[PDB]
Amino acid sequence: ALDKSIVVNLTSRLFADELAALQSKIGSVLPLGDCHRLQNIQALGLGCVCSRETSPDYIQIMQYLSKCTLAVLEEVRPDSLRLTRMDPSDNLQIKNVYAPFFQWDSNTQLAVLPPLFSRKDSTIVLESNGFDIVFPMVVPQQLGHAILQQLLVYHIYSKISAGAPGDVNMAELDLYTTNVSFMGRTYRLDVDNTDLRVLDDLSMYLCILSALVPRGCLRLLTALVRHDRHPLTEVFEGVVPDEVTRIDLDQLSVPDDITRMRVMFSYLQSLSSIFNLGPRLHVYAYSAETLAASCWYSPR
Amino acid sequence: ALDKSIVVNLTSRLFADELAALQSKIGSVLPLGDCHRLQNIQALGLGCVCSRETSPDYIQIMQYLSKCTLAVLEEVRPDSLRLTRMDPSDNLQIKNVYAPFFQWDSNTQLAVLPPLFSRKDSTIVLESNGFDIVFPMVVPQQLGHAILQQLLVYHIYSKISALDLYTTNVSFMGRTYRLDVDNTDPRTALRVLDDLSMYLCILSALVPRGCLRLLTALVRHDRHPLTEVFEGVVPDEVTRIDLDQLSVPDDITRMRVMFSYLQSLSSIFNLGPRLHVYAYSAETLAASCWYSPR
Amino acid sequence: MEATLEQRPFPYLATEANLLTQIKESAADGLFKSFQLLLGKDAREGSVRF
Amino acid sequence: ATLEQRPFPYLATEANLLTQIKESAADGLFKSFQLLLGKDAREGSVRF
Amino acid sequence: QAENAARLGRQVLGLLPPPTHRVSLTRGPEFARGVRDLLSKYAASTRPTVGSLHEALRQAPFRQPTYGDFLVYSQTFSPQEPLGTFLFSFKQEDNGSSMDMLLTPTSLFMLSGMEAAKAPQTHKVAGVWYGSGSGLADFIPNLSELMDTGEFHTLLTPVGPMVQSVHSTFVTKVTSAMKGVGLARDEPRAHVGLTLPCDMLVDLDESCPMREPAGLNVTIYASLVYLRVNQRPSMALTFFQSGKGFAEVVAMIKDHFTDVIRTKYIQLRHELYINRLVFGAVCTLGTVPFDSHPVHQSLNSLPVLVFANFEAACGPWTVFL
Amino acid sequence: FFVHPCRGSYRATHRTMVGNIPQPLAPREFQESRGAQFDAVTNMTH
Amino acid sequence: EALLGVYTNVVEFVKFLETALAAACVNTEFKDLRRMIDGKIQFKISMPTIAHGDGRRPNKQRQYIVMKACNKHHIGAEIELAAADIELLFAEKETPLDFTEYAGAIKTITSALQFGMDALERGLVDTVLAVKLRHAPPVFILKTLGDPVYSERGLKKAVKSDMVSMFKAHLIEHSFFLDKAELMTRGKQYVLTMLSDMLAAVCEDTVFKGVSTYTTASGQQVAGVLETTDSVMRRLMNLLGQVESAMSGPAAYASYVVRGANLVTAVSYGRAMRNFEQFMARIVDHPNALPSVEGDKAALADGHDEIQRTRIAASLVKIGDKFVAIESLQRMYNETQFPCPLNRRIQYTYFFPVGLHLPVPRYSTSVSVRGVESPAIQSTETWVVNKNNVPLC
Amino acid sequence: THEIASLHTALGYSSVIAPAHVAAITTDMGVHCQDLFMIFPGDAYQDRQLHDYIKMKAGGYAAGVPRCENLPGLSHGQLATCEIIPTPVTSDVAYFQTPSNPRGRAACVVSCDAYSNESAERLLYDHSIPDPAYECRSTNNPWASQRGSLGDVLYNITFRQTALPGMYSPCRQFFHKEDIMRYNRGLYTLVNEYSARLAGAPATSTTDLQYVVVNGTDVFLDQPCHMLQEAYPTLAASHRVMLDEYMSNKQTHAPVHMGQYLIEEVAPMKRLLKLGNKVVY
């Protein structure tokens, strides 16, 4: 019985060139900063947070997509765009026009990821308003948890080669990271190593974990000796490395160790959710010739 | 469509004293036990798990909170309390009268927490019926997390004592606060810590070597604003692990399992049910939000 | 529930067609499932009970 | 002799049948009963 | 014969989505007269009748599932099922146009290869629906290797209970249900509930009491446990039923699998392979209403529960340990 | 094939040459007409 | 430039009861088949015996009882109605373009409701034909089973081998009989003895044989329908005259309603009669009356006596003394792009040697071959002739 | 949804089908043999150098229609596979002019007593009993009719249907024991099941090669070689010369010459053989 439609007006008319790119993607999933039907241009992309002048971010986008309302294009009329609203547990249809092209199958789970690839694959620049709309990177969930992971390893060894040449071979790094195997098929992603400033925030976090985790687990084992110790924690003493168990904790004092343990957990919950929880939607029907996938949106 | 309203029968006329406190907090979230219109007053409190004579355990209270259905008040009549209900997935007006005051806006995020700053301020006692009522606290997720961060750090460093400024203070931009610990049962707060010792020593076994060598190139000279934890000195442990040669396909299998166990830490750092505010009014203190149990 | 045979004393009807051709051989190798012979002392209407 | 929930046109009696039924059916006064709670207490459908 | 065609004029036009609430402003305050289903308190009389309350019974919520259509080899999906079993969609590679692989929990017992006394009842029944187990294992030649690295939980997507199976000789058509209560095909006006074997299900809220809150929601969880038996890798799938919130059940599942965690990790004092460390994963198969009684049944025996008013909502697999 | 004593079982060797195929199954009038086909292919002189 | 015309189709609506295929069926409209569990037809075959006073032991009286059941069938369809089609079905009293925007949307839903009926009217003719094709064994099996002279004694071991010998000989000689009429000099009389032998092999013993269901003009009696494709029907219509090409048959189905005393036993008990009232008048109203074909015919023809007889466009034919209707169903299958079931594929297996010897006293019979006859020669290949008559090794 | 109930009131068979007019021959009746490298991909010789040597001397799905990509196009139609059953050099040619089994023993189980699996097996396998066809010999080739023989080793395999399309085997019906024992029953239970059930693993249609149909939807075919359990001979001529004698004069043709032979085809279809412009029907 309820009415859902989202109609965005503009100040100036579109060019004839820019209309053909939006007609290329007439079925899509755009994020959208407001729930009301009448709205200005400055929210419906990723230009509200990510821009050229600002430094590119991963986490501040992934914080934003969970907080944001999604929407689907229906008809592109100059100058008034016409989206439709995405509701909780609502059944609708998606065409898959995204660059680069990952093949969808039915009975997969779509995960909206931020675009970390090149600019011309991602965004469409509107010259009439001078504002950039950015289409998000819709990738299936098992790819999206793997297309991130090999590129996050590539960003680490690129930071090692820039600090010292002899530690990394480029032919070893390129062969094992840029080629992604999924569902039997392979995808050679565009590396864009021409100068990945998106993933520098995650490469800072996962390393600051990696030093503080084995320093942190030694204290948390010994501080929990009881008669009522949980019986599975006797097992995982055989998992910890022997070099980890030899820490002299006399080197760090008590005013240093409270700072570490609060830094220890505060990265752990901030980094756990940004791998886990995004706007994620299922697909139950697909046809490759029409490129039309019927979906239903689960908000989490 | 659906109805949701709970009118609470009560066996004694309330006094004008306790009627003034309940009239002051007229929009307020509190859990209750059973899903019916008519209800005893002994379900409305959170005090069925948080009593005076029993030592409360705030994790178990918070563990209790994700089970219960939640409710918002509508009126306080001198006989009966009248409440409305929160069900998935319904938009509803919520109005914060919560005494350690924080500021919200449109498109904020919320979660429900037990009273962790002032129990005496957040619990009013009913001497008329003998049963006391405990209100919970609603907090945005950033301080919603950062209180449970400091509470788990406390129960690690109270056991080592077998002083206060580092253990019991929640930090935030602009303000500092005091957690309320005088009598806490740590045992339900320690089975959480027992499972942290399970995950964290597995995460110490599958550490990638290239990410440790990245810090040995970083923190010695390249000083950044967010690496001031190490204070410019490498730890003694990090120099001991990077003696091997780096190889890419070893860390590919490590960073997948590093990725998959950080999916599991959601289960140990869970808040209660979450509240997604889409519109919040500033001068009226009301909001609009849809309830999602997870 | 499967449909089952029953020997109740129905008021059977009379058809113009004959049915007799090939029945003795069709009972041996089954032309049709769920049959029952009745020889001489038992070829009658069974007694009605309820 | 089988119990069945077919929608019979049940006839009405003057005498009450309710005295000690909560603790006679549970302790086995009479064989072959069936208790029906809530939405089950209905004359459901006919299927021949 | 237009009397047959006017029936579809009745039944299609009566069975549509409710239209958008749009009234022109020049008509005036007539839109408030068209808000009937938001009104939720109806007047009662001294003797209320159906003719008094046929308007109160008329406004109903808008509920509809989203079915799935699967086309299955008839060797895998056994031709006789109790019509309410839960399903999974194993997926390795798109080889053809549409040939889909579906796994019932009794079929996934046979690919596992676990011991008899782990599930003592369904081993007899799943051994008569199938052969020795190699009628199914020829489709997945990677069952030895998917269990070592631990990729098998990433390849199952929980779909939901059956609604209809139209069975042919070489190919079985299977229509399942996502997003809610699927409408029963053969019986009209009916609802297909979800049927689980009593052997696989592990209840979680059970007490003397020796008091816990009630609610509106109790959620069936699935689990899948990587283990080793006879120095050979094998899996174990169980079910869980509790309304305790996700923060407790992950701690409640670890107490159930305490023995299996210990007997595995006695091995890795000698060999430490990082691929072996992944142990289990937990999905969320959708909610059950509170205080609906699971009704026991028996089929050939095989004791099989059934849940009324099961509505489905699939979740991802999260790796617990 | 042959029987091998111990329960006994059937065990196998291999007829290596062609002529180890027994004479009811590859007779001698065939086996020298097969030889004259060898003689005419190679174009040898006797 | 301008348009010249806009042309579309009108879908040819062909229902079940207008086709001649309902001569092979008996049609009853049954209101609530959603409620039925099972069907039942109960035969009771009383077999007489000859008394003869040889050394035989005489037989007592025999009796057979035969049970039959229904078979359910389910048909599906599909309608996809658009979003804005349902949306603008409601708002009106706008500009006259919004009437012709509205009236173009009711023309979309009614054409989508014809299509839901058209896909279901073809479903009857599909499932009825697919029931006939499952209970239709071929000629070569049934011909030597339809004559009692081979199995008077019973099917022992020596009879079955003498029937399998006749399955093979009828399969090699008399198969593809309309293709063999070209090369035979007799020709048109061979097919007519072939196709009347298919006619005499079918069991005519139907319960409804005395029921008068179809007739011709001048009251003659239609017996059966033979169904071909379009290609075979051109042959059979030219060899044999289409003598009348119009038959009489019912206009509607037979009704069966569970009203009355059927409804009490349907609700109280789990069963229900067919025609309880006529069934009652035999048991209690007039007992101990032996069944006799002459006066019991009104209870066999329940409903099918007195349906309005209407003229049916068809094509009949003379075979012996039996009139046969000839159908072709390709217009109901080629318009929907589904392949016809009477078009059909037959797989044979072809047995074939290569590389043998011949034993020692070698012989010949050929008068004219000059070459190969030397004893030292050996054949290491055999030649086959293809479909396109290209010989290959 | 529309619900229709159908019921058969006649006792005997009230409908009879018959083949009338051959429209076209689909399968090319040519010479292409089945390659076991592709059906049994696992088994191999020990040396990689010698197993790659023998593969040099011999040698998937697409939108639901399985297509072979080694052949770009075909001109004679769907390409027929051939097996090879090895056979002694002294097996009689007189077995080959009459329709029979490719193994040396006749396998018609319809004649045997109903529901007697041991009497049916004893017909197929035991050699105390001469053939139901021939009283002179027990078996034409002991390489295929014998119980553990290479016919019964290769082609007794129940179909396993990998993710790859899988390929059809003409010999596999004549050797498979369990699909033969399905016909051990009474006559009228066989005639009822003849037109209703599609038998075990037949060939596909309108493809490149003969694939075993793994998705049976609307494939209508019926095949009489399972029931009657014989295989029909074709034209064979061990030299090119003796195929000329069959087309010059069909009557005074000699079936067996000194070294060579000929088999005239005995088939339910009788084609027009036309080589040159001389036509022999």
PDB file of N, CA and C in Angstrom, chain B residues 61 123 142 200 228 233:
ATOM      1  N   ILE B  61      24.211  -9.375  32.708  1.00  0.00           N
ATOM      2  CA  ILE B  61      23.080  -8.468  32.541  1.00  0.00           C
ATOM      3  C   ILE B  61      22.924  -8.083  31.078  1.00  0.00           C
ATOM      4  N   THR B 123      18.424   3.882  38.547  1.00  0.00           N
ATOM      5  CA  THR B 123      17.438   2.987  39.139  1.00  0.00           C
ATOM      6  C   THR B 123      16.661   3.774  40.176  1.00  0.00           C
ATOM      7  N   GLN B 142      29.865   3.750  19.054  1.00  0.00           N
ATOM      8  CA  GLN B 142      31.272   4.058  19.287  1.00  0.00           C
ATOM      9  C   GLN B 142      31.591   4.047  20.775  1.00  0.00           C
ATOM     10  N   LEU B 200      43.018 -15.426  20.526  1.00  0.00           N
ATOM     11  CA  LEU B 200      44.141 -14.507  20.388  1.00  0.00           C
ATOM     12  C   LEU B 200      45.465 -15.246  20.246  1.00  0.00           C
ATOM     13  N   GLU B 228      51.939   5.907  17.391  1.00  0.00           N
ATOM     14  CA  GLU B 228      52.605   6.396  18.596  1.00  0.00           C
ATOM     15  C   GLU B 228      52.462   5.450  19.787  1.00  0.00           C
ATOM     16  N   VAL B 233      60.226   2.616  19.546  1.00  0.00           N
ATOM     17  CA  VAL B 233      61.090   1.478  19.829  1.00  0.00           C
ATOM     18  C   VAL B 233      60.380   0.217  19.356  1.00  0.00           C
TER      19      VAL B 233
END
